[PDB]
Amino acid sequence: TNPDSDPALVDYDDGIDFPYDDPPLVCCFGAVQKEFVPVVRVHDNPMHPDIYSQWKMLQWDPPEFGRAPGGPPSNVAISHVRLGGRAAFMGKVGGDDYGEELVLMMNKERVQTRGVKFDEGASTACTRVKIKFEDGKMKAETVKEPPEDSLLASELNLAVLKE
């Protein structure tokens, strides 16, 4: 019953005896965000800086790395359920409105959010950083990680992981 213990001693057990419902459950682990393409590289032929209506031209003539961009694991979980599978998302969100909204976003998509933890003293998708001018170049350092990047090992839902 200890998520932070070594997964070599007694399991979490509990009262699961009946067979699991098909299709098999899938766990998507990590941060929860909407959109937020992570794969970012330097690309040539930029469109107009201000006129975003021209940016569609880079959607049908995309950078080779952005041909099929990935996203946060929540997108994989949401897309998996719409394909007929069952997906459960494990992660931590803040107690603010956005954390409720993100959890509401996954709940409406039939994604099992039983593995989603709430950090009341945190702001969802909010990273507090300190700006420091080092070697003449402005930089930043993560003072406090966001609740997405703050899921402790003791907050894991072993019921999700077993299934």
């Binding site: 107009h48 209506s53 021209q54 031209m57």
Partner: protein, 60 residues
């Protein structure tokens, strides 16, 4: 410059672009074709300085 490349162009752009061309280029082109004025040779000579043409916003 990339007006109709991505989005649907403005339906009045053809009317819009034509008039701006006329104001920008269609005025001096015709004014430059205005010749000198004189009968044969007398105490008279009339001409227009094309480069000094100006347009004033309508009062109304």
């Amino acid at each position: 410059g990339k007006e109709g490349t991505s989005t649907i162009p403005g339906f009045n752009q053809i009317q819009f672009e034509g008039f701006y061309r006329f104001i920008d280029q269609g005025l001096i082109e015709e004014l430059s074709k205005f010749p000198k004025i004189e009968d044969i040779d007398h105490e008279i000579e009339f001409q227009l300085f094309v480069e000094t043409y100006q347009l004033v916003e309508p009062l109304i």
